[PDB]
Design a protein around this ligand. Sequence first.
Ligand SMILES: CC(C)(C)NC(=O)[C@@H](c1c(C(=O)O)[nH]c2cc(Cl)ccc12)N(C=O)Cc1cc(F)c(F)c(F)c1
Length: 97
Amino acid sequence: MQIPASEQETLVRPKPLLLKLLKSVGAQKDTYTMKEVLFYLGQYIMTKRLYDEKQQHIVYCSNDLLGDLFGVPSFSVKEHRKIYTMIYRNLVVVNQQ
Ligand SMILES: CC(C)(C)NC(=O)[C@@H](c1c(C(=O)O)[nH]c2cc(Cl)ccc12)N(C=O)Cc1cc(F)c(F)c(F)c1
């Protein structure tokens, strides 16, 4: 639940499945900052109503594309590093020159 600000601005290119997910919720770019990826994934979770209705800080992503991407049935929204790691496996970090 704490990512350095420098890492939040890291430029990334999502792989096809994550890209298609992001474009369904209003994102149109092919290159993002991690800050942008996290925002649009949070919007996707809201749109697909994947957050726990009982408000116990858990996303239920089983049998949804997000669960396919993350490789988990569910996860805690309080564990930012583990969420970043799951997202990192679905993108390429843009090389800096
Ligand atoms: C589940 C709902 C919809 C209620 N959203 C959240 O609670 C959630 C959130 C956001 C956001 O705000 O935009 N974007 C996400 C993407 C995913 Cl996969 C999961 C959770 C979130 N969150 C907010 O505090 C926690 C959070 C904020 C960050 F900044 C992070 F890096 C992080 F790992 C976790």
